[PDB]
């Protein structure tokens, strides 16, 4: 649980995302919320002001407000403040969920794809079982730290990594069981940079190998910090007097949900 | 986080 | 449960999309399944063709065969049959899933709705509410029958039917605990129709009568029954030998799911 | 869809049982809801009485009354009446539930249980596999119609159901698919009787045969029916003239859940 | 994720508990699960002896083997083994469920019930809203630290703990259960107290059901779970003679605990 | 359902 | 009706 | 978890 020094706003953003095995896009949904943390009751009559960058009539977003927050105002000037004015926001430190959105792309389309991925398979030989080789490449300014694949058999044989195939980021098993099957970690995805994970792993039959499902968070604590769609907060103000500037923090996140290659 | 209300 | 004669094909596709209040076309999903019957057990060595005018290869799809099937013969002859060719389907009239498929569709792009929606809400000028208009436009060429729609609020006054700014269409409430809120039913909405549905119903402002969510679900029993992504039967043949044809029938339906104006 | 005529009150109850393989019970859990629904505005500022034979005050079933249920109310006197005394209750046919209860019970304990099951198991004489014998009895005043079995496995080989061991010659396999695996329905079970199901069928080793399932649901229509627990209604009064009393039709059902010998 | 020297076990439990406002027992229901992990090759090949002190026919358990495992071994010699001999373990450090097992208990029946617990409210005399008392008794052998009670609402107003009456407890962000969360630092082992606070709601209906969130591990050979699971020995399934080295955690956590 | 609205 | 199996 | 395989 992070910290709240008052008020604590956090951007979360969760990607899914569906490959062919040649790596062609399928689909992707990413879902977004904006919850709301006040600790401090001096500072629960407050107003969030997002970014001007935000285009709040973009109807691919589906951007909705929760029913006690005043969609009008939202979408005249990209405030977030309570429909009954005379209210204040709890501030017991609850997480208050206050807008959502929601977008999709079809099939070819990676601009909500912060990771693309191709796999290449064939029979081993040197071993009973499967030569496979994951291709990934990023497209974040940020690092990726602790990415997880899973393939979802369990062999009777350890998972040999193919450390000269793979990357010069570091690979290793581990245990991770929000996913069913055989999970390796790679240490590192750098910022916009391209790598792949190869290994030997026994299954009875190639499409035994599939899905291969992806796992990783990033998050970000920091005033300014944006979110992957470009959600932000410009400042935090008093409901009566938006002159009047409050203190905050902003943590953005990134996580993947169903991120698979299939 | 939804069904908070005010 | 439909009656079984011996191998029964019923080829069963759920569609979600979701358009904004003025009818723009935020995303839509549909997901398929083909599932097979067999009460017969001199029926249980049989493999399935598909029709020819099926796209196999179409990524944007993301067919999925049963592990136990035969992903190759799929890929190949468009034919499903098992993985293991001494083995037969069960024959006990157990529903086996063994095609699965999965298509999505981003803004603005109609391709996978059968059924476009845009409301018009004003002030009522007689309850403390809204006068409501749902239109709506098929672009199938059957029929929907007994068509739902559903407004999340419990109003204190009776919802009144505006027969004059409606289609004739035997409007009425009906209880219908699958959605929450105020359900109202249609008979029918002709194939290629277009039509609205009017009404005023309490709301203590316009952002609670949404999300408004329709329901509907069609089928036809028919051998040479097409789903609505084109998905059919060419011939059931058996395994050993694909000359010899043998009996079956198919159902086709299309159902609603997350089917809503926001 | 039952039809309303003004008042309709349905009294739902859900039964959950889990038995050894030797009959000896595990556990059992109920769960009930009274709902109303209302499609007359001239009916919705009433109040239901429940009948004087149910104990309210009855710890073990944690009666709990709908956020807008007066509580007090309830447990004084066995009335169903909102907690704001100038409201009424939502008449737009939509289903109200209005208190709900729970009742558990532990191993060897058969007061929640209508119906006790026992299964007896042995290698088959001509299948490959195993000649079951499922034993039930009832405790219910009204008949089971189509009771369903579910075992847990998908033979190559059709189900031998053996009349000469079944109460019912008449048992047949079933398509039911909210259950996994091969089913057998059975068209009825006497009230107060005890009678048997046996059959053969393939399956791997006996433990593959277990869980079995069974699945029933009745129900009742009488303004006089009382449920499975004893719940029933007195009468339906005016909110502020309880000498005045409404018209009214009572629906009572009993349901199957997770009933199950493992 | 705790780490793995080769074989690692893990005994789960979860526990439901309910009870009225004054602290009847309504129902409570015990849910367990034995997890083998293994990362080392040469420790696949293992089977797991349960402490003898385990009653594996008791039926009201309901143990159950996972498909792969032989049950017959378990039912007489309380081993955990596969039931095709010529298999071994999956040796990818992947949690494997071998073993499951649920207990119910019903109304006024504190068997299965590690925290006990009582509520009374009133109309605060001092200030705006409710003054809650939750009683509690714990009957564990160790201490519960971290323990997080919610109320089902969202107050304008800062919760006031009343000091007097419990000292160290706080409200905090838990949002693993709706409304506001106060957490209390520890509950000794058999111990009995009170938290008591002044909450603001619009009637005393509102503030239930009142949810409790607990969760406590160890890590030892010989630890025991709350109903007693154990094991006695790692074992080479060629060689019942020859032990393996391993470790054992244990963990009770809350599930749907509260009061309505 | 419980989700209902006076 | 995808856990079916043999 | 209790969807494993040998």
């Known amino acids: 649980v992070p910290e709240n020094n008052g008020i604590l706003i956090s ?63 939202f979408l005249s000037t990209k405030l977030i403040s309570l429909r009954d004015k005379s209210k204040a926001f709890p501030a017991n430190d609850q997480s208050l969920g206050v807008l959502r959105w929601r977008k999709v792309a079809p099939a070819e389309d990676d601009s909500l794809i912060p990771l693309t991925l191709t796999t290449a398979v064939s029979p081993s ?35 040999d990594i ?16 929000q996913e069913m099957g055989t999970s ?12 792949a994970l190869a290994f030997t792993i026994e299954a009875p039959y190639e499409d035994a190998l599939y899905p291969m499902t ?24 008093m409901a009566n007097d938006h002159d009047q500037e409050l203190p905050y923090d902003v943590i953005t996140s990134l996580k993947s949900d169903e991120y698979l290659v299939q | 986080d939804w069904n908070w209300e005010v």
Chains 1, 3, 4 share one sequence.
């Open chain 1, 11 to 73: 951007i979360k953003e969760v990607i899914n995302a569906e490959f062919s095995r040649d790596g062609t896009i399928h689909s992707s949904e990413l879902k977004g919320v904006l919850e709301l943390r006040i600790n401090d009751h001096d500072l629960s009559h407050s107003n969030l002001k997002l970014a001007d960058s935000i285009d709040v009539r973009d109807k691919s977003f589906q951007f909705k407000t929760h029913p006690n927050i005043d969609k009008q105002s």
């Open chain 1, 125 to 159: 030989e040197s071993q009973q079982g499967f030569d496979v080789i994951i291709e990934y490449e990023s497209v974040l300014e940020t690092e990726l730290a602790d990415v997880i694949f899973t393939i979802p058999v369990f062999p009777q044989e350890p998972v």
């Open chain 1, 162 to 177: 193919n450390t000269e195939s793979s990357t010069c980021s570091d690979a290793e098993v581990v245990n991770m069981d």
């Open chain 1, 184 to 195: 390796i970690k790679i240490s590192k995805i750098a910022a916009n940079d391209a790598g």
């Open chain 1, 214 to 237: 992806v796992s990783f968070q990033e998050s970000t604590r920091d005033k300014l910090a944006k979110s992957f769609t470009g959600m932000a907060i410009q400042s935090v103000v």
